[PDB]
């Protein structure tokens, strides 16, 4: 509350529109982090089961232009390109949703006179179901899990996919 | 590390080039310095300067960069 | 995920996204009452 108000004072431009450190930003980032945990699980499954065609094939520079060449004389793999395009699909969906939101959906950029949602605090009430509380709880948990997964990957030396598999118990692959 | 061995014959490379506008001829023309990717050859003399100071490995340069980041902070 | 991917991941960012966002925000700031 104090942090939210002081940020609203410091950066009226972002806070007035709902950007920055706001409950709306928290909700949106929780949504994206949950979707991202799901995406990591799905890519783990696909990679383990070999469902990605030509995963280890290096894209041809002659065909795909200089963009197909990586930083240090390396080539982007077909697997990396496929995953990037999979992200491109949802990124276009994202731009379209942000510029032309559904009438019923929540809007990324809030109007000038919008009423900020009440800051939940330590934990919102445990309203079990498809409810704005459960959404926030799971979004916070997913964001924390994303950070934890990255740090486990870096510390233990395992890949992020390997860490996800180990945590889930090798059910994925 | 390969310049400190034969400094009079090796060209010191400043940094790698990643330009999505380069053609294959440009990439090949800029691939020099004994590396395998297009590069810029330094004209600042930092190689000679650091070699004289006492830097021999890339870890020394990395530690110096870390310290200077800390000092900037 | 190796360091060799960092140039391809970053140069487009630093050269198109950072300038675009900076230009948009600076435009909004300079033209604002």
């Amino acid at each position: 509350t104090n942090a939210i108000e002081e940020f609203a004072e410091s950066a009226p431009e972002l806070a007035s529109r709902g950007l920055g450190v706001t409950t709306n930003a928290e909700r949106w980032n929780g949504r994206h982090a949950m979707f991202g945990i799901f995406a990591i699980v799905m890519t783990a499954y696909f990679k383990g089961h070999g469902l990605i065609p030509d995963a280890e094939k290096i894209l041809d520079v002659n065909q795909w232009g200089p963009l197909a060449s990586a930083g240090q004389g390396q080539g982007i793999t077909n697997e990396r390109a496929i995953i990037l395009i999979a992200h491109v699909h949802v990124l276009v969906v994202s731009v379209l949703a942000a510029f032309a939101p559904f009438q019923f959906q929540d809007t990324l950029v809030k109007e000038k006179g919008y009423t900020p949602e009440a800051p939940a605090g330590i934990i919102p009430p445990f309203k079990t179901g498809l409810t704005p509380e459960a959404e926030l709880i799971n979004g916070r948990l997913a964001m924390l899990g994303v950070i934890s997964i990255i740090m486990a990957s870096i510390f233990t030396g395992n890949s992020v996919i390997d860490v996800v598999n180990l945590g889930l118990g090798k059910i994925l692959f | 590390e390969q310049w400190v061995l034969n400094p009079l014959k090796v060209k010191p490379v400043a940094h790698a080039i990643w330009d999505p506008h380069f053609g294959q001829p440009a990439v090949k023309a800029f691939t020099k310095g004994g590396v395998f990717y297009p590069v810029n050859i330094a004209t600042s003399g930092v190689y000679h300067w650091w070699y004289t100071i006492g830097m021999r490995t890339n870890n020394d340069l990395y530690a110096g960069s870390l310290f200077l980041l800390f000092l900037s902070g | 995920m190796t360091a060799a991917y960092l140039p391809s991941i970053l140069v487009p960012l630093i050269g198109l996204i950072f300038p675009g966002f900076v230009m948009g925000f600076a435009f909004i700031y300079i033209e604002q009452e």
Partner: peptide, 30 residues
């Protein structure tokens, strides 16, 4: 020879310096 972990430590220090730079920019703008 420079490892990804080394580059990541450098990036973390750069991010810390960026945060401090933003703080200084705000304080100077005031």
């Amino acid at each position: 020879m420079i490892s990804d972990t080394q580059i990541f430590v450098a990036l973390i220090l750069a991010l810390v310096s960026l945060v401090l730079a933003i703080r200084l920019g705000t304080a100077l703008y005031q």
